[PDB]
Amino acid sequence: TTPRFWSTPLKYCRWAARERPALFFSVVIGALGPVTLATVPPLRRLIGDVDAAPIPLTYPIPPGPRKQLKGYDDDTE
C-alpha cells in the first residue's frame, strides 16, 4: 500500500506530504536552509546588494609610521 522511496521516488514524496506532513516538511524546511545559503547570496551580489562593512569592535589603529604631529604642546596649555 504505502510506497517505497527507492522504487518510486516521486510517488513516495506525495504520500509523505499527505500522510506524514510534519515529518516530510521538516526535511523540506531543513533543506531550504542549505538552498537559501547557496542561492540568495549570489543573486544579492547580482542586484548590487553589497554586504555592509563590519562594525569596529576594537580601537581602529591606522597602519604605517607615526605622523610626527606638531600642535597642542605644553607651551600652548
Partner 1 sequence: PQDMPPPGGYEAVQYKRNLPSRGLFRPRPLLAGAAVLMLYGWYKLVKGIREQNELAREKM
Ligand X SMILES: CCCCCCCCCCCCCCCCCC(=O)OC[C@H](COP(=O)(O)OCCN)OC(=O)CCCCCCCCCCCCCCCCC
Ligand Y SMILES: CCCCCCCCCCCCCCCCCC(=O)OC[C@H](COP(=O)([O-])OCC(O)COP(=O)([O-])OC[C@@H](COC(=O)CCCCCCCCCCCCCCCCC)OC(=O)CCCCCCCCCCCCCCCCC)OC(=O)CCCCCCCCCCCCCCCCC
Ligand Z SMILES: CCCCCCCCCCCCO[C@@H]1O[C@H](CO)[C@@H](O[C@H]2O[C@H](CO)[C@@H](O)[C@H](O)[C@H]2O)[C@H](O)[C@H]1O
Nearer to ligand Y, 5 or 49 (CB): 5
Task: Rule CB under 6 A: say whether 4 interacts with ligand Y.
Answer: yes
Considering only residues 9 to 38 of the shown chain, the ones binding ligand X according to CB under 6 A are none
* CA 77 vs CA 34, 43, 44, 68, 70: distances in Å: 62, 58, 54, 19, 14
Question: Which segment (6-14, 26-34, 44-52, 61-69) binds ligand X by CB under 6 A?
Answer: 44-52
* Residue 40 interacting with ligand X (CB under 6 A): yes
CB 48 within 8 A of CB 40: no
In this structure, which amino acid lies at residue 49?
Answer: D
